[PDB]
Structure 1
């Protein structure tokens, strides 16, 4: 009966989202974030056991001069 795109069932889903489901998502995420912090701490703890530049400037200037010299510019003529 009621389709996937059904407004009624989607609205029941949306009411349900904000309850137990988003709670469980956010709590799960907090736990995984703490595990990541543990992981980085362990790794740093084993660690203690021991323009942009001239390249990009010439690159861009050449590219723009080639586009102006072959008449192939999106932005200028």
Structure 2
């Protein structure tokens, strides 16, 4: 059987990873960043409520 370190299956994994998997990763990270910005804005709005 092909090993975990098998070069052919490693090349196949690399070419697969370069595509749809990485696209999913990038979209996920963008959404996570957007909701992190939303979280910061929410806390800053609570601080603004305190000031007001």
> Do Structure 1 and Structure 2 share a fold, with TM-score over 0.5?
yes
Q: For the pair shown, which has the larger CA radius of gyration, 1 or 2?
A: 1
* 2: CA distance, partners of 1:18 / 1:31: 20
Could you state the TM-score of these two structures normalised by the residue count of structure 2?
0.90
Q: Tell me how large the CA RMSD over aligned residues is.
A: 0.4
* 2: CA distance, partners of 1:31 / 1:18: 20
Count the aligned residue pairs.
48
* 1: CA distance, partners of 2:33 / 2:19: 21
Matches within 5 A, 1:1-77: 1-48=1-48
- Identify the structure with bigger relative contact order (alpha carbons < 8 Å, sequence gap 6+): 2
TM-superposition CA deviations, 1:53-76 (whole Å, max 9, x none): xxxxxxxxxxxxxxxxxxxxxxxx
Structure that is richer in helix per residue: 2
Gaps (5+ residues) in structure 1? 49-77
